[PDB]
């Protein structure tokens, strides 16, 4: 009865969306054929597939997903891929022309000819759902289609539904390992759209994953398959509590009231641990003692921002496996004892605790083997100001004398809008500086 | 390049490049493996690493 | 070659023979003789099976005697553990069956 | 979907187009005798990009063939793989251009271009959603410079949204094939800049230089030269035919490479290329390909980048590969050569990947260059034009066919204006 | 509780280490796969002194293997019992110290040593309460000394109250294996004597004599040599990991064996030793065990045991055997060797009884004493040192990495003074 509708738009999301579902598929025992034979279980068990799947009355399960992109290239591979018989035949929206990495195209001219289908699909989707708890949307910010259609879609929801909480996982350009040349433009204007419209944002920069993959997995030539695997874990990591028995269940509704002190400060960064491959794992111990300790290692963070460069504002952790809760308290206490990690003055209690028994599931053929414990660290800190600053520094140099501006201007977007972006992006930064001051 | 080559000759006389033409003198009859690989997306998320095993 | 393993050696040692036929034990083995090497029996003696008519005679001599019928039954389960075509039993193999036996 | 068109004019245009169509037929699995003998199902998944369907499962290429001299049409038709082309696509006159621009844009073309426009319009409208046009022509020749450019203006005026592609083989002062080469070419640049969105010049003298040095072949011929270009533009359109990790289309290429509308001139190259001697002694990894890509002599235009600075450049990789290596190599080349890349634009290199490489190699790379070195190419031609025009040598032919010296002077002024406006950024600093 | 870690540096330490680790496991029945297979409780009562646990229930030994070259480790793990060690502890260089004290001690050793200290620091803290470390190395290896000493130095500078144990091999000139042995052997003595709390020297040469004579085996190998040493170490800690009549931790042995501060050099021997030809005659008894201990062929150091006097000696009787005859034998031993026992310090015999004997035998005895006989070895090595220095032959290398002849002069005089100070008590009388 507790269900969440997933929204995926853009090339960046689609593959990460591809990764999340497979593991989601694996965790329930629903093979790509669309069935859940299990140990010949027919009615002799609980009803836990509600959280991410819906019953059709006799047989298969239809995922609660809607897919959006303007280039049929990405959709086609999924439609003819290894999961061709699972997704709804028509809920896989396919476009006609590529967004060509331009925001103006993806937000004012070509993106307005497909939203109608998206909302129609979602409205019907919400109808089936009875215990809607929120929304999870995966999108990319460095692409015209990504920011554009995603921003427009999110805006539409804001008025259509309103108070329904939103949690979105975006992918900002890496600090230095970056591909697109006009990506910063789309990002900032994307930030304005989601700045005052989304509730919880989880930074998921790409470069950080590479080091996590290389250093710990000890892989020197990772591919896009590997990075997607990690993200699916966290996505499955954060929401797995709602659907399995746990000592202290935590609902997606219990993040806006426990992690965002102020309405505008709602940008947060993630990290994951433990990370161990299938070769050097069984000879290591993996105790709650150090697993928590490693989670706070700056080099292990899932984003390229040094937590040592700012105070800590609010934290939230979830435990899994056979963790004895008292073990949870012991790990936290010493962390406070350590002086390297420091909190702000106005947050007396800054640790939210939750324990879910189920062990993380392993998809064969991957990198992470079967461990008996793990922890997901999701914390909001004032240090994230730098990343917004660094993007701002890039914008100023490439906007001082109208770089590639005419491409965006001609599509209809007003020139003065960019002045609006600079005002909002810098305004948020100046907001963050004041927050960290001491009383 | 722009300057002419004084010596033309037939083949067999190792004068000029001679060696370069030899290299590949079999490669004209050297075969090349044809066919097109099986993509990247179809490589990782195959029927394996699923609920079938 | 380094070690003369293909010269057939002399059946009597000359006390001053400086060559090795491969029968000498390297120091890794020397420091840890197989337990019962100190009374003239090597551990590769319980792995040679013996017949019940002689197996028993070994067993009444020790002081462990079992009545006919119970002797035959215990022997058979000893063979059942053996799972060998030959009726002869591994004497130690009967040593494990007894432990599980007697109850 | 996202289908495109091809218009080839003049002798050079016909040659390059025939080679490209041969290569594309090879890649997709099309046989002269048209039926499908391709193996992989991936090939037929999107074959509609460059081909229609006809009764009997015989594929036809959406090409347009045109010229004012009969031999070129007759020669390509007689040869193998020229039998795929649509005869109805054949249009031509019986006069000839004779290396006279005015003969190619004012007197004869106007009488015959009426038919050509109809064919192109009908063929284009036939398909569902166009993506652009890629035209092959020559600026130093007679027919190509005029007939194609006139077609360019009309097509652009009719269809103001879809982008266009052009392949121009500009002449160079090393090897010359016409004594009046500067004029028709110089006047060509005047009209083409205002309309042609994307242009990727090609220089012959680089062909011989690249042919002689890296290939080391003793006796090369026209077939050798034409073949390379087919590879470059076949690779430029690779993601649009095959899936990949990050699809990048034509519009994507222009958006990431053209900062301002007046600076839309590019230079390209191809890799990997190995001499017949050392084919099997070297591997296939991101390192080697990236090292050869930026080499000065690996480019496909007479301009030498080392005297200029790149503004924007994009790499369209092919085949499988380790992405982190792709990103790492690109940054390394960027950092170790900051002097060659202008500063006020951070991250001035693009990347892309596709899942299918050309038949017969593990992977390959196609490179597009937008650097200030293209200033030298125009400068040298401008030098010749002024000398030829001061005495008005050969001017009577062009004065006697309705043209006016006012247009010549306007064109000469325009070329210098573009040269100055394009060289400005080399010394311009943030 | 009060356990220890086990650390290797240089080529020698690696080869000896593998034997000892394989020696320890089979005693408790720790199979290579890491799944327990022992039988008795005592085999599991105190598994903490040398093993930890992780996920899966398997056991791993807290040993951090160090070497400056890859070759040895690539094989050692490739050999039997290469599966118990944590690969996380594998940290190694790429160049190799080249048997040069200068290279592995100041130039290259300093750079890589950071990692081991972090792991060494990490391992020590995890324990409930630590007692000390044991380090195996040889003074004849340039790579071994460089990293080894610093690890000896820095660790002590980090933990003052723990028990540092090292078993180094001093190369007697009879069996020379390298030209530069005299140099590196002496220098390592300079630092180690200052900080190393305890030292137990073993001679390869003396090792051979025991193997050839007692074992009466025609051809011994490195396995035979180092395997012997592994026994002594087990008897060194044998009293620490099992119940015994007279328990004696490593610290306790320290109290009874170092009458004076700087006199901290030890020599040990393991008995009984029998030959396969002589296996089934000898009478394993306290009577037989004692007699072998005090023979010159019982002790693995080249220096003749009757060429001085014994400062103090102790033996950790292994296996179950009453002490009454043990003590009477001890006084029996002391009186009929009194002429060799130093006169001013009576009661210089130590006895401890451990019920756990090495597997496969009945009784076991080990010898640990401090005798003046160790003076010769330093003399023989020291004498060789003077000859080399006079002409400065091969001194150029050390100067090439920052070394200066002043330091070389300082070390020797410190060494020589040690010998004089040690023989100072040799002639002392009450
Ligand atoms: N980590 C990761 N990032 C991706 C992936 N796919 C796309 N991206 C991001 O997308 C950015 C470039 O945008 P595109 O590749 O054009 O994808 P898009 O956002 O959907 O834009 P369109 O191509 O117009 O659809 C890159 O900078 C990446 O950061 C992916 O599979 N993994
Ligand atoms: N690279 C290359 N260039 C060619 C080839 N054939 C002709 N050209 C060039 O084309 C130019 C002649 O243009 P032309 O065909 O006469 O133009 P047209 O008179 O308008 O048809 C010459 O300067 C040549 O350099 C060829 O096969 N390869
Ligand atoms: N007992 C024993 N001694 C060895 C072994 N290998 C080397 N040595 C001794 O080490 C000395 C030379 O050490 P060296 O090779 O320089 O050590 P390395 O620099 O770490 O490789 C020689 O005098 C040998 O006696 C071995 O396997 N067993
Ligand atoms: Mg895309």
CB neighbours of residue E20 within 10 Å: 22
User: How far from E6 is each of D280, E64, E80, E140, E154, CA to CA, in Å?
Assistant: 50, 7, 19, 21, 16
Phi, psi of A65 (to 5 degrees): -135, 150
Which tokens sit at A29? Answer: 């025992």
Which tokens sit at E282? Answer: 């000898």
Phi, psi of C19 (to 5 degrees): -105, 155
Among E113, E107, E180, CA closest to E140:
E180
Calculate ∠ Cα E53-E54-E59, nearest 5°: 40
Query: Does the beta carbon of E279 lie under 8 angstroms from any beta carbon of chain C?
Result: yes
Which tokens sit at D181? Answer: 């080469």
Atom in ligand 2 nearest the alpha carbon of residue D68: 21
CA atoms of C24 and C29, how far apart (whole Å): 10
CA atoms of D350 and D344, how far apart (whole Å): 16
Strands D199-203 and A373-381: unpaired
Chain C contact set for E220 (CB, 8 A) = 26-27
CA atoms of B51 and B53, how far apart (whole Å): 6
The residue whose CA has the least distance to atom 5 of ligand 2 is D12
Sign for the CA dihedral angle at D22, D24, D27, D32 comes to negative
CA atoms of B13 and A35, how far apart (whole Å): 73
D254 to chain A, minimum CA–CA distance in Å? 9
Calculate ∠ Cα E394-E397-E398, nearest 5°: 105
Phi, psi of A55 (to 5 degrees): -85, 135
Q: Are the CB atoms for D236 and D303 separated by under 8 Å?
A: no
Q: Are the CB atoms for D368 and D266 separated by under 8 Å?
A: yes
CB within 8 Å: D324 and A72: no
Long-range contacts of A338-342 (CB under 8 A, 24+ apart): A340/A308, A341/A296, A341/A307, A341/A312, A342/A311, A342/A312
* DSSP secondary structure code for residue D259 in this structure: S
| Torsion on CA atoms E284, E289, E291, E293, rounded to nearest 10 | 140
Q: Is E426 exposed, middle or buried (0-12, 13-18, 19+ CB in 10 A)?
A: middle
Which tokens sit at D89? Answer: 């696509």
CB neighbours of residue A177 within 10 Å: 18
Chain A contact set for E89 (CB, 8 A) = none
Q: Contact partners of D by the rule of 3+ C-beta pairs under 8 A?
A: A, B
User: Is A128 strand, coil or helix?
Assistant: helix
* Domain range list for chain A: 3-267, 268-386
User: Is A373 strand, coil or helix?
Assistant: strand
CB neighbours of residue A33 within 10 Å: 15
Q: What is the full DSSP assignment across D63-96?
A: EEEEESSHHHHHHHHHSTT-SSS-GGGEEE-SS-
Phi, psi of E210 (to 5 degrees): -65, -45
Q: Are the CB atoms for A187 and A151 separated by under 8 Å?
A: no
Q: Are the CB atoms for C48 and C32 separated by under 8 Å?
A: no
Resolution in A: 4.1
User: Is E327 strand, coil or helix?
Assistant: helix
The domain made up of A3-267 has a fold known as Rossmann fold (3.40.50)
Among D1, D10, D302, CA closest to D149:
D10
User: How far from A423 is each of A10, A416, A430, C101, D178, CA to CA, in Å?
Assistant: 27, 11, 10, 89, 59
Element (DSSP H or E) covering residue E168:
strand E163-169
| Residues annotated within a binding site of A for Mg(2+) | 71
Beta bridge partners of D350: D314
Q: Are the CB atoms for D109 and D151 separated by under 8 Å?
A: no
Q: Where are the beta strands (DSSP E) in A134-276?
A: 135-138, 166-169, 200-203, 267-273
* DSSP secondary structure code for residue C89 in this structure: B
Which tokens sit at A380? Answer: 């909001």
Long-range contacts of E222-225 (CB under 8 A, 24+ apart): E222/E15, E223/C26, E223/C27, E223/C28, E223/E19, E224/C26, E224/C27, E224/C28, E225/C27
Which tokens sit at D413? Answer: 């002024």
Method by which the coordinates were obtained = cryo-EM
Let me know if domain D265-374 sits in CATH 3.30.450.20: no
How many whole angstroms from D415 Cα to the centroid of ligand 2?
22
How many helices (H) and strands (E) chain A has is answered by 14, 11
User: How far from A249 is each of A252, A320, A352, A375, CA to CA, in Å?
Assistant: 10, 12, 12, 15
CA atoms of E243 and E235, how far apart (whole Å): 13
CA atoms of E93 and E300, how far apart (whole Å): 33
Which tokens sit at E247? Answer: 């328990």
Q: Where are the beta strands (DSSP E) in D171-210?
A: 199-203
* DSSP secondary structure code for residue A301 in this structure: B
| Residues annotated within a binding site of D for GTP | 11, 69, 138, 142-144, 204, 226
Bond into D164 cis (ω within 30): no
Q: What is the full DSSP assignment across D130-173?
A: EEEEEEEE-SSSSHIIIIIHHHHHHHHHH-SSSEEEEEEEE--S
Sign for the CA dihedral angle at C14, C16, C20, C26 comes to positive
Residues 6+ apart with CB under 8 A from E33: E58, E83
Strands D265-271 and D364-371: antiparallel
Residues 6+ apart with CB under 8 A from D232: D268, D269, D270, D300, D366
How many whole angstroms from A73 Cα to the centroid of ligand 4?
8
CA atoms of E358 and E234, how far apart (whole Å): 9
Q: Is E8 left (phi over 0), alpha (psi -120 to 50) or beta?
A: beta
Q: Are the CB atoms for A329 and A396 separated by under 8 Å?
A: no
Alpha helices in E46-106 (DSSP H): 70-76, 101-102
Element (DSSP H or E) covering residue E92:
strand E91-92
Chain A contact set for B38 (CB, 8 A) = none
Bond into E91 cis (ω within 30): no
Residues 6+ apart with CB under 8 A from E370: E257, E258, E259, E263, E265, E266, E310, E311, E312, E313
Among D43, D77, D83, CA closest to D61:
D83
Strands A61-63 and D364-371: unpaired
Architecture, CATH, for domain A268-386 = 2-Layer Sandwich (3.30)
Render the burial of C72-86: b for 16+ CB within 10 Å, e for the rest: eebbeebbeebeeee
Q: Are the CB atoms for D17 and D63 separated by under 8 Å?
A: yes
CA atoms of D195 and D37, how far apart (whole Å): 40
Count the alpha carbons within 13 Å of E244 in the hemisphere toward its beta carbon. Answer: 23
Q: Are the CB atoms for A272 and A377 separated by under 8 Å?
A: yes
Which tokens sit at D326? Answer: 């792709």
Phi, psi of A231 (to 5 degrees): -60, -45
CA atoms of E66 and B33, how far apart (whole Å): 47
Q: Are the CB atoms for D2 and D131 separated by under 8 Å?
A: yes
* Domain range list for chain E: 3-256, 265-374
Among E208, E218, E212, CA closest to C13:
E218
Residue corresponding to tokens 């596709």: D354
Element (DSSP H or E) covering residue E296:
none
CA atoms of D64 and D53, how far apart (whole Å): 17
Among E236, A77, A429, CA closest to B45:
A77
CB within 8 Å: A285 and E88: no
Closest residue of chain E to A285, computed from CA coordinates: E54
Overall CATH class of domain D3-256 = alpha beta
Q: What is the full DSSP assignment across A314-328?
A: EEEEEEEES--HHHH
**Residue D152 CA, distance from chain mean position:** 15
Q: Is A427 left (phi over 0), alpha (psi -120 to 50) or beta?
A: alpha
CB within 8 Å: A178 and D324: no
Q: In what order do the strands lie in the sheet with A351-356?
A: A65-68, A5-9, A135-138, A166-169, A200-203, A267-273, A373-381, A312-321, A351-356
CB within 8 Å: A32 and B53: no
Q: Are the CB atoms for D295 and D333 separated by under 8 Å?
A: no
Residue corresponding to tokens 């790429």: E94
Which tokens sit at D66? Answer: 């045109």
Among E362, E342, E354, CA closest to E279:
E362
CB neighbours of residue C23 within 10 Å: 9
User: Is D364 strand, coil or helix?
Assistant: strand
Q: Are the CB atoms for C94 and C74 separated by under 8 Å?
A: yes
Q: What is the full DSSP assignment across C26-72?
A: PHHHHTS--SGGGGT--STTTTS-B-HHHHHHHHHHHT----TTHHH
* DSSP secondary structure code for residue A56 in this structure: -
Query: Does the beta carbon of A97 lie under 8 angstroms from any beta carbon of chain D?
Result: yes
Q: Contact partners of A by the rule of 3+ C-beta pairs under 8 A?
A: B, D, E
User: How far from E362 is each of B53, C30, D60, CA to CA, in Å?
Assistant: 54, 14, 94
Q: What is the full DSSP assignment across E354-401?
A: ES-PPTTSS-BEEEEEEEGGGHHHHHHHHHHHHHHHHHTTT-HHHHTT
Atom in ligand 1 nearest the alpha carbon of residue A142: 11
Residues 6+ apart with CB under 8 A from B7: B15, B16
Q: Are the CB atoms for D149 and D192 separated by under 8 Å?
A: yes
Which tokens sit at A200? Answer: 């919880």
User: Is B20 strand, coil or helix?
Assistant: helix
Phi, psi of D9 (to 5 degrees): -135, 150
CA atoms of E30 and E27, how far apart (whole Å): 8
CA atoms of D420 and D422, how far apart (whole Å): 5
Q: Are the CB atoms for D384 and D278 separated by under 8 Å?
A: no
């Amino acid at each position: 009865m507790r269900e969440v509708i997933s929204i995926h738009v853009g090339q960046g999301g689609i593959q990460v969306g591809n990764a999340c579902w497979e593991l989601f598929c694996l965790e329930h025992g629903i093979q790509p054929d669309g069935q859940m034979p299990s140990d010949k279980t027919i009615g002799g068990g609980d009803d836990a597939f509600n959280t991410f799947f819906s019953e059709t009355g006799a047989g298969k399960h239809v995922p609660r997903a809607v897919f959006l992109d303007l280039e049929p290239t990405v959709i086609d591979e999924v439609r003819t891929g290894t999961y061709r018989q699972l997704f709804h035949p028509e809920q896989l929206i396919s476009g006609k022309e590529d967004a060509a990495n331009n925001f103006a195209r993806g937000h004012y001219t070509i993106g307005k000819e497909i939203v109608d289908l998206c909302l129609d699909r979602i409205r019907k989707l919400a109808d089936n759902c009875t215990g809607l708890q929120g929304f999870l949307v995966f999108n990319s910010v460095g692409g015209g289609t990504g920011s554009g259609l995603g921003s427009l879609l999110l805006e539409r929801l804001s008025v259509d539904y309103g108070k329904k909480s939103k949690l979105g996982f975006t992918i900002y350009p890496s600090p230095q390992v970056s591909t697109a040349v006009v990506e910063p433009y789309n990002s900032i204007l994307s930030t304005h759209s989601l700045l005052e419209h989304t509730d919880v944002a989880v930074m998921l920069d790409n470069e950080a994953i590479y080091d996590i993959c290389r250093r710990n997995l000890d892989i020197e030539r990772p591919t896009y398959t590997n990075l997607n695997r990690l993200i699916a874990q966290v996505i499955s990591s954060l929401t797995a509590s709602l659907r399995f028995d746990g000592a202290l269940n935590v609902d997606i509704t219990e993040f806006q009231t426990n992690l965002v002190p102020y309405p505008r400060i709602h940008f947060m960064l993630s990290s994951y641990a433990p990370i161990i491959s299938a070769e050097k794992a069984y000879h290591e111990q993996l105790s709650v003692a150090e697993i928590t300790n490693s989670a706070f290692e700056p080099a292990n963070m899932m984003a390229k921002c040094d937590p040592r460069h700012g105070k800590y504002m609010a934290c939230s952790m979830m435990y899994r496996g056979d963790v004895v809760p008292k073990d949870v308290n012991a790990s936290i206490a010493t962390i406070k004892t350590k002086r390297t990690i420091q909190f702000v003055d106005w947050c007396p209690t800054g640790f939210k605790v939750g324990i879910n028994y189920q062990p993380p599931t392993v998809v064969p053929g991957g990198d992470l083997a079967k461990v008996m414990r793990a922890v997901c660290m999701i914390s909001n800190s004032t240090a994230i100001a730098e990343v917004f600053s660094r993007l701002d520094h890039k914008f100023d140099l490439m906007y001082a004398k109208r770089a590639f501006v005419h491409w965006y201007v001609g599509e209809g977007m007003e020139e003065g809008e960019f002045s609006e972006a600079r005002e909002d992006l810098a305004a948020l930064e100046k907001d963050y500086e004041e927050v960290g001051i001491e009383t | 390049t722009i300057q002419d080559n004084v010596n033309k000759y037939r083949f067999g006389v190792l004068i000029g490049n001679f060696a370069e033409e030899k290299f590949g003198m079999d490669m004209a009859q050297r075969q090349i493996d044809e066919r097109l690989p099986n993509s990247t997306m179809k490589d990782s998320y195959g029927l394996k690493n699923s609920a079938l095993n | 070659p380094t070690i003369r393993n293909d010269i057939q050696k002399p059946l009597m040692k000359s006390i001053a023979d400086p060559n090795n036929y491969g029968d000498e034990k390297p120091a890794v083995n020397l420091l840890f003789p197989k337990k019962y090497d100190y009374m003239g029996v090597e551990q590769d003696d319980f792995k040679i099976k013996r017949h019940k008519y002689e197996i028993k005679d070994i067993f009444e001599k020790i002081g462990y005697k079992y009545k006919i019928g119970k002797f035959e039954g215990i022997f058979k389960r000893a063979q059942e553990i053996e799972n060998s075509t030959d009726n002869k039993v591994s004497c130690s193999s009967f040593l494990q069956a007894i432990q599980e036996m007697d109850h | 979907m996202r289908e495109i068109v091809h218009i080839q004019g003049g002798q050079c245009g016909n040659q390059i187009g025939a080679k490209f169509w041969e290569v594309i037929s090879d890649e997709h699995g099309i046989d002269p005798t048209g039926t499908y003998h391709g193996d992989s199902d991936l090939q037929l998944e999107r074959i509609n990009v460059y081909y229609n369907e006809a009764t009997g499962g015989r594929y036809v290429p959406r090409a347009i063939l045109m010229d004012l001299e009969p031999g070129t049409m007759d020669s390509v038709r007689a040869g193998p793989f020229g039998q795929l082309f649509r005869p109805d696509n054949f249009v031509f006159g019986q006069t000839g251009a004779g290396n006279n621009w005015a003969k190619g844009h004012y007197t004869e073309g106007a009488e015959l271009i009426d038919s050509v426009l109809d064919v192109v319009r009908k063929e284009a409208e036939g398909c569902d959603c166009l993506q652009g046009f890629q035209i092959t022509h020559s600026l130093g020749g007679g027919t190509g410079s005029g007939m194609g450019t006139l077609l360019i203006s009309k097509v652009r005026e009719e269809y103001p949204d879809r982008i266009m592609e052009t392949f121009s083989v500009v002449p160079s002062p090393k090897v010359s094939d016409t004594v009046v080469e500067p004029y028709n070419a110089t006047l060509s640049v005047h009209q083409l800049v205002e309309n042609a969105d994307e242009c990727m010049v090609i220089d012959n003298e680089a062909l011989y230089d690249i042919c002689f040095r890296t290939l080391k072949l003793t006796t090369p011929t026209y077939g050798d030269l034409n073949h390379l270009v087919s590879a470059a533009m076949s690779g430029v359109t690779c993601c649009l035919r095959f899936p990949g990790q990050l699809n990048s289309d034509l519009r994507k290429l222009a958006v990431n490479l053209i900062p301002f509308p007046r600076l839309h001139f590019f230079m390209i190259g191809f890799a990997p290329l190995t001499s017949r001697g050392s084919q099997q002694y070297r591997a296939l990894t991101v390192p080697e390909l990236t090292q050869q890509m930026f080499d000065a002599k690996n480019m496909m235009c007479a301009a030498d980048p080392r005297h200029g600075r790149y503004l924007t450049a994009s790499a369209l990789f092919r085949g499988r590969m380790s992405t982190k290596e792709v990103d790492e190599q690109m940054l390394n080349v960027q950092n170790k050569n900051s002097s060659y890349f202008v500063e006020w634009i951070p991250n001035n290199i693009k990347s892309s990947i596709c899942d299918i490489p050309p038949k017969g190699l593990k992977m390959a790379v196609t490179f597009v260059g937008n650097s200030t070195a293209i200033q030298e190419m125009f400068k040298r031609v401008a030098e010749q034009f002024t000398a030829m025009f001061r005495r008005k040598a050969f001017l009577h032919w062009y004065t006697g066919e309705g043209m006016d010296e006012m247009e010549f002077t306007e064109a000469e002024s325009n070329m210098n204006d573009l040269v100055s406006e394009y060289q400005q950024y080399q010394d311009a600093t943030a």
